[PDB]
Design a protein around this nucleic acid. Structure first.
Ligand SMILES: [Mg+2]
Ligand SMILES: [Mg+2]
Ligand SMILES: [Mg+2]
Ligand SMILES: [Mg+2]
Ligand SMILES: [Mg+2]
Ligand SMILES: [Mg+2]
Ligand SMILES: [Mg+2]
Ligand code: NA
Ligand code: NA
Lengths: 343, 156
RNA sequence: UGUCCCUCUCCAAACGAGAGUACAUGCAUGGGCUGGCAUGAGCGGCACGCUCGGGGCUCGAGGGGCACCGUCCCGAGGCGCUGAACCUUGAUGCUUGGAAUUUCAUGCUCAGGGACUUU
RNA sequence: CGAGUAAAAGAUUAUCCGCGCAAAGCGGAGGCAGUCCGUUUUUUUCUGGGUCUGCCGUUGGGUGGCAUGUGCUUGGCGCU
RNA sequence: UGCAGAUCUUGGUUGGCGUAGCAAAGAUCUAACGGAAUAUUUUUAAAUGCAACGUUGGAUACUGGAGCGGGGAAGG
């Protein structure tokens, strides 16, 4: 959580301090490896073709195998032998000509870098692959941007801006098989109920002589895909290796990083770029989440407000943390018994 | 055919990264392989494991087992019998054996605080023997210690 | 050439299914960190103890009992060594890649085994 | 074995590519020897060296960019 | 003296079905011996013989004298 000053004329908190919980997400730079184009038909959009980069990393090619270390690792080997030849160059020009002539949508294939995100608890080593649409400009200009981006890194600060809103797509936490009370929120039954009270008393009338789809039943709860709207961006931080004073504001001059004392529980340390979103996001820790540019109009006073952080909390999330930094804790306690042994 | 000795990319990268070490100010904290309290960059840790022959049939090993992490929120009247099974599987996996004798000294120590009071930590002595294909088996015994601090696995 | 089973992990999980890993700081053990409780056993009473080789410190008890005045003993509790001692990842906290008169260090793997793919 | 593309555009999709409107029109293309088959238009293959680009995997070398242990861009060497 | 049914009579067979279950009286562990019940492979050790039984020694725990103690009547 953080502390900030709000600017909202006519409100009771105008020019006053508030406390807001936030969510921290680690964002290593992505790599662009492909270009795809789409054309419109009376039955929907159809892919035209794909242009691949000449050099791809091992973490990208790990995705196309179930047992990478015990395989022949032959993916993309034939294409590498042909792409840069005279015939290969001609074939690539033919595909790019088709994109210019008859495409409607231009997208780029990108993947994450789990090697740079050196997390001890995230076990997956094969990269996550997805498509990102390119908006703005004519079709020719879209293709020009995609070619310049091929085989290069993209940092999150070049996509989003601070004090902007965004949309979150994620899968929620799972709960397995669940009863109607938790799954749907129905009311419990009196205490004297024979055969149990955590149920729905009547599941239908005599006619129609079947159960309808609108009646609550027991089943799977959680692990669903959801899309949530209008999450403001409170900070776009950079990697701790470059600038260590991540959590230092103009009103709190203490030098500290964004990782709390003792580390995030079950995750560890944040070692790369990161984004601070106001509120909560779906899913547990360590899960991969997609952020996209807003869909709803962004013209309200709440959406256009400028955010200026004043204080950032870094106490331990294990127990009741009461020290902001390691130096603060070692100032409260004097020299302990172990330190006496050392000296 | 699956030899693939290679080990060359490590050679190339280490000679390269040494080449542009000359800078006005280096920074680049760990990029140079000269660093303290750090891993060796460019290769896996398992590549540095010393490979010898197969160990002899007759060996003796001293090891500690953290039992409280294996018995958490377990049903009370099952803790002592479960701990016996966990110790057997712990040792058997290490020694690649299915015959593991428990011996009275270790069995008494596990049960010496009742069925629901299994001690959190234990130190054991494991000896592997063979007799007559050949048959391998293990004998596990108790090693009383005053404290468990600063104790690590040893091979005699 | 590939997929699955056995062995390993948990963002998943009634069983199937899933996310993963395939000698990997992977697993185990220990050390630090961060937290929880609240000051262990043993010994001791103006020093030959504790604290800041030599110099400055500081050191209880309501009562009771032997032995011709002190000395020797029994006594809940209290004080010193002592923010000591113990626990801290396991259905599953951090740390071997920011820096730091200190944060990580050892041990085990030794051609993985099996089924199918008419390819 | 019962053959219909929300595909292309031609010696009936064969007999090369690039630009161009299913235009007008304008550009580029290695050569030599056998063999083996062949109802002609420089006939099909398979073979052999001599060879020249683009390009692999390389021997090392130096310039450099990227978030900095992992791969790239350079620039030569001898190798298909 | 001719059968398809009488909630027909007597035998046999049958889906349901390897299903519903076999959940009061707290609880077993270990080594040696016994046993045909193993340490069972040809096509190094683990990933190809599992699971379970009695006696003795040791450990743990229950009954708790209105006892899963020691004797009788009725009944057997
Ligand atoms: Mg009732
Ligand atoms: Mg907490
Ligand atoms: Mg009849
Ligand atoms: Mg059953
Ligand atoms: Mg029942
Ligand atoms: Mg009782
Ligand atoms: Mg009792
Ligand atoms: Na009832
Ligand atoms: Na009785």
């Amino acid at each position: 959580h953080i502390v900030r000053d709000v600017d909202r004329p006519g409100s009771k908190v105008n020019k006053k301090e508030v406390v807001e919980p936030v969510t921290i997400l680690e964002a290593p730079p992505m790599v662009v490896v492909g270009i795809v184009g789409y054309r419109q038909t009376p039955v929907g959009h159809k892919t035209i073709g794909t242009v691949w980069a000449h050099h791809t990393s091992v973490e990208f090619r790990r995705r196309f195998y179930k047992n990478w270390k015990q395989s022949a690792q032959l993916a993309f080997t034939k294409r590498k032998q042909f792409a840069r030849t005279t015939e290969g160059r001609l074939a690539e020009a033919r595909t790019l000509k088709a994109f210019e002539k008859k495409a409607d949508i231009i997208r780029v294939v990108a993947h994450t870098q789990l090697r740079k995100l050196r997390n001890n608890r995230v076990g997956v080593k094969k990269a996550h692959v997805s498509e990102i649409q390119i908006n703005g400009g004519t079709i020719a200009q879209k293709i020009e941007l995609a070619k310049s981006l091929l085989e290069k890194e993209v940092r999150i600060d070049s996509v989003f801006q601070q004090s902007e809103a965004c949309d979150v797509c994620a899968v929620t936490k799972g709960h397995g098989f669940t009863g109607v009370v938790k799954r749907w929120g129905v009311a419990c039954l009196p205490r004297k109920t024979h055969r149990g009270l955590r149920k729905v008393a009547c599941i239908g009338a005599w006619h129609p002589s079947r159960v309808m789809y609108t009646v609550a039943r027991a089943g799977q709860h959680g692990y669903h895909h959801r899309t949530h709207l209008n999450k403001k961006i409170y900070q776009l931080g950079r990697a701790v290796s470059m600038e260590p004073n991540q959590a230092t504001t103009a009103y709190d001059l203490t030098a500290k990083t964004i990782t709390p004392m003792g580390g995030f529980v079950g995750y560890g340390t944040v070692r790369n770029d990161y984004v601070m979103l106001k509120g909560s996001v779906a899913g547990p820790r360590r899960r991969v989440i997609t952020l996209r540019r807003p869909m709803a109009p962004q013209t309200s006073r709440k959406l256009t407000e400028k955010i200026t952080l004043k204080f950032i909390d870094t106490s331990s999330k294990i127990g009741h943390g009461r020290f902001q930094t390691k130096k603060e804790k070692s100032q409260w306690y004097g020299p302990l018994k172990k330190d006496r042994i050392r000296r | 055919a699956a030899e693939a000795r290679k080990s060359r990319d490590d050679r190339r990268w280490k000679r390269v990264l040494a080449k542009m070490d000359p800078e006005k100010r280096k920074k680049y904290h760990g990029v140079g392989n000269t660093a303290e309290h750090s891993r060796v960059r460019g290769c896996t840790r398992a590549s540095l494991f010393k490979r010898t022959g197969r160990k002899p049939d007759n060996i003796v090993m001293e090891a500690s087992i953290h039992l409280s992490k294996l018995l958490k929120k377990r049903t009370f009247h099952k803790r002592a019998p479960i701990a016996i099974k966990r110790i057997r599987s712990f040792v058997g996996k290490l020694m690649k054996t299915k015959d593991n004798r428990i011996d009275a000294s270790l069995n008494t120590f596990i049960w010496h605080k009742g069925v629901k009071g299994v001690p959190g930590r234990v130190r054991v002595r494991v000896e592997r023997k063979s007799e007559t294909r050949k048959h391998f088996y293990t004998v596990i015994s108790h090693i009383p210690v005053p404290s468990f601090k600063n104790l690590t696995t040893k091979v005699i």
